[PDB]
Amino acid sequence: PKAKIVLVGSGMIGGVMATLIVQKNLGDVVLFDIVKNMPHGKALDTSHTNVMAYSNCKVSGSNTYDDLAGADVVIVTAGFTKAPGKSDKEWNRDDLLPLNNKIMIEIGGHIKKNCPNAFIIVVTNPVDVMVQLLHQHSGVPKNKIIGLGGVLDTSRLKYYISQKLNVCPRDVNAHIVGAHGNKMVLLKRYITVGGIPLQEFINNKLISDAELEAIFDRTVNTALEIVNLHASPYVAPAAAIIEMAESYLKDLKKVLICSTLLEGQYGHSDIFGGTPVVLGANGVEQVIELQLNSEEKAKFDEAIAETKRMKALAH
Amino acid sequence: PKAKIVLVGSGMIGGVMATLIVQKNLGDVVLFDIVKNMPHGKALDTSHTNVMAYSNCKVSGSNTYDDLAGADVVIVTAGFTKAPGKSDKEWNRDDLLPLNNKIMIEIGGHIKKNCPNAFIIVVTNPVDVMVQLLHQHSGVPKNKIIGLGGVLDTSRLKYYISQKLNVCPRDVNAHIVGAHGNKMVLLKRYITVGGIPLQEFINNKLISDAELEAIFDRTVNTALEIVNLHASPYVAPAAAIIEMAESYLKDLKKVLICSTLLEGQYGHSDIFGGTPVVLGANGVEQVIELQLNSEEKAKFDEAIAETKRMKALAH
Amino acid sequence: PKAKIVLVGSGMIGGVMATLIVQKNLGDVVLFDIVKNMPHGKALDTSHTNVMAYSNCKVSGSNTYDDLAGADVVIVTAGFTKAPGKSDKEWNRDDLLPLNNKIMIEIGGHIKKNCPNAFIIVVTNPVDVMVQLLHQHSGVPKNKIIGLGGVLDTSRLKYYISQKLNVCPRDVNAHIVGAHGNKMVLLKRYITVGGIPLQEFINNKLISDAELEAIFDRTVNTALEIVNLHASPYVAPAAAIIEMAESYLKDLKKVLICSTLLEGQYGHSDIFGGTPVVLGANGVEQVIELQLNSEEKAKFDEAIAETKRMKALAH
Amino acid sequence: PKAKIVLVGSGMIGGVMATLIVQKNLGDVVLFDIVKNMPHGKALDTSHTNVMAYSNCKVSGSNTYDDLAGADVVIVTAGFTKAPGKSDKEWNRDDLLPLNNKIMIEIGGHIKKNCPNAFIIVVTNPVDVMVQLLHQHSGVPKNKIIGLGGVLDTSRLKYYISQKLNVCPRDVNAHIVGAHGNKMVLLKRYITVGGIPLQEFINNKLISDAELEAIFDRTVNTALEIVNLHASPYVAPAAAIIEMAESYLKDLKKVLICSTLLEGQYGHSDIFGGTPVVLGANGVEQVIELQLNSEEKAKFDEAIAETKRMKALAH
Ligand SMILES: NC(=O)C1=CN([C@@H]2O[C@H](COP(=O)(O)OP(=O)(O)OC[C@H]3O[C@@H](n4cnc5c(N)ncnc54)[C@H](O)[C@@H]3O)[C@@H](O)[C@H]2O)C=CC1
Ligand SMILES: NC(=O)C1=CN([C@@H]2O[C@H](COP(=O)(O)OP(=O)(O)OC[C@H]3O[C@@H](n4cnc5c(N)ncnc54)[C@H](O)[C@@H]3O)[C@@H](O)[C@H]2O)C=CC1
Ligand SMILES: NC(=O)C1=CN([C@@H]2O[C@H](COP(=O)(O)OP(=O)(O)OC[C@H]3O[C@@H](n4cnc5c(N)ncnc54)[C@H](O)[C@@H]3O)[C@@H](O)[C@H]2O)C=CC1
Ligand SMILES: NC(=O)C1=CN([C@@H]2O[C@H](COP(=O)(O)OP(=O)(O)OC[C@H]3O[C@@H](n4cnc5c(N)ncnc54)[C@H](O)[C@@H]3O)[C@@H](O)[C@H]2O)C=CC1
Ligand SMILES: O=C(O)c1nsnc1O
Ligand SMILES: O=C(O)c1nsnc1O
Ligand SMILES: O=C(O)c1nsnc1O
């Protein structure tokens, strides 16, 4: 029987996710939200695309937490997108902390009761904090919950480099680790193009170090760039989440960078941080530790310290 | 070289269209709008999905009409979604008439100048009126412009019946003609399930005539149902438009119900109305005239009369 | 975890099936055959396409019946393609009877022992006979075993008509029932184009009755036409089988014409015959009985009588 | 209008290619061969899959060279698969030289006359020799003709490593250069897993150097392994060719290792050899030169020397 996918939060990212799930025929979808009627409306609209897509996925709205019962995958976007009061210039994910904390606790209790065996993907910011909080309150095993970060951050870095080099976007591979936010760690040493070290393209003057520095800055500030032009990013975040959910559902075993519980990797324990993992039928099947140098490790440490700082304020 | 697809209007439907184009690798996309910066922001967000989708489609924003130059396909959603002043209870597509008319004229002039050989899909309501107005002002051949209607309306009818019968949505086929709006003509006689007349399923008590009447009413009022729950429909409309655009771009020759210039079919000329057409490389390759009975023709006439009434008020 | 799909028979059709399964990422594949080493060779070749296809399906060869253990779907092509001694001019599926009978019994015993809960698709000719024999010896429920016939036969009829009318092949729908072989029943009354009765296109002189008669004859004799040009058909048969297997695996609920146990439909019981069925997670979820007229019923009876004649000779 | 793809040679690889083209709706297909009727038979069988695939690609057979007229892409598999007289134990691509040389000249003349603007992919062995011969006789620009090699060879290396590491096959990237045959150059230094250097996985004892040496040997001898089990490889070769053809047709700009004219790269000129190239709308858009060390260069030189040796014998 089809997988049951519950989207806890039916806002902008939730809507794109439901659309992409039907396009890919991935499973039945529940759009859950605290807002009355809205999820039912989005679900109805989305359900009709089964015709155009040649798919057969139910799409239903919900205002009832117990509809989590029987969930195979739960995706959590519930929460605030901006500190009610701060300008778009001064956004920052850190300010979402006080707004989204209590929400993870409430959701965690309902997961523990209704679907303790579900695979969980957390999106709510600041994600590296929120994911651990949900882990602690839902009681699920460490191999069954991850947070969105690296797939999204690297899509931007990969894309921008592919534009400069005039190659297929997917042919650029790259790693961003530690945390999802302004302290994200961009690993220049681990960038490849068609499996070839980026340094060879730099040596050939096909792309310069200065151009790469500008792309790095653009990558870190992308969410901000989009807000200064439109609104909180939702299309690419949704596509990133679905790539993760799909790897689990279809046992693809893709290597994808996500927030996961660290147990000594990079010298860190008792905290979640971004690192390449392998996602398949058993959830997080492997946690891959990059063999970072001391300079890279120092930056990783800065990222973890910021997650810890915000974790303390959420309590 | 890739097709160039210009979305004239970068609102809700435009955003889903850009997303679906990248998912399907259909061509380069321009999100054009009169609103400053917003299209650039949506384009940036959407562009990153090339990575997750294994695609290579440029996505760019625009505030400049001359970016229509070189367009292979132009999709027009530009306009108003609601009479600024009327409640959601009392919506009606007819009220969008005074709000969207001048916009078609302006767009038509820019198409004539920049991309006279493009294939045009009109979405702005009331669509059967707006499409003819754009046809007259853009100067394009009758085989190169159509309006959205039947693919969207029938997706709802097909979906609702498939739910009751527990079969694949695409396996239900159905026809709604005349016009897109409250006078749409639902043809009960032309419904099939797996290619089998629906009447056989009625004879077998698998679905009743009364159940079908309720589905018919729900179908006509779907846009209203969604607004009373959320907002103007955008996900299914977008998927319907892309199915049409894809048939053209890839020379699929799909039979799809769209608004097209009538030249004697059903007894009507000099007006656009909804009817099955074949869409391929040469645009509207065939206009199919259903052999309607007198009772069905009477309803078709009512639909055309309403298009004519609104056409007169737009002038 | 991924579905396990065992192909009992690794000849021409088995090879295309394995290829298509990897293309669609449908599940792990076992190519089983009595021929030593050959299945291992085909499996190795096919396994490499996971790279090009972005898939992750194991493909393994087997010469051991107990590898049926854990099978979710079993597809049976094992047997003879031609009476060793008869020319290509005089082929006939009936002559395969004495060559393939004992093989179904042997396979059935291994299914009963190793995978009694698997969904079975039988291909070996004459299929309407062989499928019932396998049903009786494997002990599986009637909703869990079907035979290939109508999806393949109608693909030809649909294709040939689409060529004449210049429309998308999938837009032509049609029904062929009773049995797969020279007595197949072509139902002219149940042909549609874009959901529209074919008779309307005949009335419009877009296709004539005489042209349709020629297409009907070509359809019945297609296997023979291909043999007189090349060899036993294998590419379309494989695609037809995979469409069936996919509907089951992904709970699509497609209406597809297949050989299934009749329990009074068309007046027949205790025999398998071709009729539209709905295929989903629970196997044959629905058996649809077409409301045939007496002339059509007479032809259906002729088809069943031929299945019965050959059934008797197989015993 | 749809691309026209002519398969010059309708044997085993040609058949899989036609099937995959229809699955992907890539363009119209002509199966050309010198064997009477056979291509027509395969074309007929394959054409029916348009129904199951939701595609609309014509598939036609041909025994007439002038059907090359209007070709957008030409794929050449025409020739011998084995020296008529040598055992399967002692195969070797070198022995195909005397059997396939005159065939390239004949085909080249017909291309120059009928489709001088087509993009050409050469498969016939020994490929690095045959591709240059076809280049010289067809008169096409150097950016419009390539040979199959690295995409196929690396699929095996990538696959075998992915099996050991339990990750998605596509997540392993690797490079094999110089020539397609027993002198292929496997570059251990350029292997990555999820974009991470393979050496990190070796350091972590997840895979050993000894295991990699065995995989390397298996990779070079794969064609032989399959023949000792079944027959000349055809499924993966076909998938590799289609990935190349698709990158061209859809302007994907994928980095793919293929045989191309060298003009100083690696110190070599006036010969074709395997190296990463970028394939898009303009054919070979970029030729990428790996920054090989002296030890790797020495092996590249050995590969080129073997191509030169056989080139001389073909004249
Ligand atoms: N991890 C990452 O890489 C990214 C994280 N995000 C974060 O994801 C979150 C969602 O983003 P959007 O969808 O754009 O926001 P949105 O505001 O459009 O949607 C959030 C929805 O959650 C609902 N909600 C509030 N409490 C709830 C509860 N208890 N249960 C269910 N629903 C509840 C709200 O009514 C709202 O509809 C934000 O915190 C954003 O910062 C956004 C992009 C990327
Ligand atoms: N034909 C059909 O079956 C359907 C038609 N529609 C109609 O499509 C239209 C668009 O719907 P949505 O995208 O939801 O509305 P929306 O309001 O979200 O987007 C409309 C966009 O057009 C822009 N615009 C205004 N004048 C313009 C101009 N001269 N050039 C370019 N852009 C301009 C606006 O700034 C706005 O961003 C509405 O009229 C709606 O009624 C909606 C659903 C179905
Ligand atoms: N139902 C339908 O619409 C169609 C049915 N067919 C039938 O399907 C059958 C297979 O066709 P092809 O693949 O082209 O034939 P094929 O001859 O290429 O393959 C048959 C394979 O079965 C193997 N085999 C024999 N006994 C076996 C056993 N006990 N267990 C496992 N394998 C065994 C043979 O070694 C051979 O490799 C034929 O009977 C053909 O008539 C073919 C096309 C359509
Ligand atoms: N480059 C690579 O990585 C690989 C190359 N190959 C080579 O590709 C070639 C084809 O392989 P298969 O399809 O398995 O062989 P095959 O023997 O099944 O097909 C070759 C076909 O070419 C036909 N032919 C002969 N002369 C012709 C002409 N003048 N015009 C058109 N057709 C002609 C033959 O009748 C035959 O049907 C072989 O040389 C093989 O060694 C095979 C695998 C990989
Ligand atoms: O990175 C993003 O796209 C983003 N938008 S709002 N919150 C985020 O993490
Ligand atoms: O039918 C619709 O989905 C619709 N929403 S607003 N305007 C429309 O025609
Ligand atoms: O119908 C067919 O394609 C066929 N080829 S051999 N046996 C068959 O039923």
Ligand SMILES: O=C(O)c1nsnc1O
């Ligand atoms: O490498 C191969 O798959 C092959 N089979 S025969 N000739 C070849 O190059």
